[PDB]
């Protein structure tokens, strides 16, 4: 499914993400944007031979699943697959676990280099 971006932003809303651990709603609608244009489906393969999976492209190396990654860990005890869903609850639960870590929303590339001291609330502009 490809949302829409007051869509996906209520649906955010409504699963908890809004100011999770001090970040504030348009963060999140702005990575979601900018790693898979508010794709569920998308995906893409590492260099290294790990894939990231659906709207916030959640690594295998480290969080999910996929049976094709040698040593690499399941943090978030899902398969990749159900990350791709046009539910969006497993991809939010896993993605509560990875902000938390330690390092924030950097571990996202794309919030880094793209969203990171920028006007966010913008994305979520006109929302009801």
Sequence with gaps: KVF??????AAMKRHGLDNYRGYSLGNWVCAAKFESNFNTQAT?????????????????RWWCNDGR???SRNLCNIPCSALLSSDITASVNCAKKIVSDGNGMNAWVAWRNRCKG????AWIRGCR
């Design 44 to 60: 893409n393969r590492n260099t290294d031979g790990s894939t990231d999976y659906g709207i916030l492209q959640i690594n295998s």
């Design 4 to 9: 829409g971006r007051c869509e996906l932003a």
């Design 118 to 121: 920028t006007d966010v609330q």
């Design 69 to 71: 990654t040698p040593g």
